[PDB]
Point group: D3
Chain length 29, copies 6
Amino acid sequence: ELKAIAQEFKAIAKEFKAIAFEFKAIAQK
Amino acid sequence: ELKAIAQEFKAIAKEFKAIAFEFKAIAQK
Amino acid sequence: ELKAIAQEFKAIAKEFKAIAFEFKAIAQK
Amino acid sequence: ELKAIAQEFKAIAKEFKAIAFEFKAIAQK
Amino acid sequence: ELKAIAQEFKAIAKEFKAIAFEFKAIAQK
Amino acid sequence: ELKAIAQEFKAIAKEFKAIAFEFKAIAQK
């Protein structure tokens, strides 16, 4: 279940990377 | 994009909720 | 010692849930 | 409405600071 | 690796602390 | 300073991606 912990942080990172793109897109206005 | 920011943070909260339960199970033997 | 970590991630999830709710009411114009 | 978001990220930082402190005392064997 | 986990969470707490101040400045005009 | 918010989430994502590698590395034991 550390494998399971690791997979869950992998998804967190993917979600924060999209949030970064999103805010910058807003900031490009 | 604000609408997209919201669903991403909702998905993050979910992942952190699942992580907590996990660690609670490693701590509980 | 992992218990304290478990509780702290539980509190983090509580906070991201509220952030999501806030950006949604913001995106609601 | 951004104030509530500001306070919530402030509480999140407080929690990750404690998590870091905990894994360090764990890594201290 | 536990030692590396700790410094990463310390770096995360720092980033979230800076985000909070930022949002506090957008909210404060 | 939304550009600045975005850059800070970019770094958060980078830190959580390393944490994922780290835990899995531990789990591979």
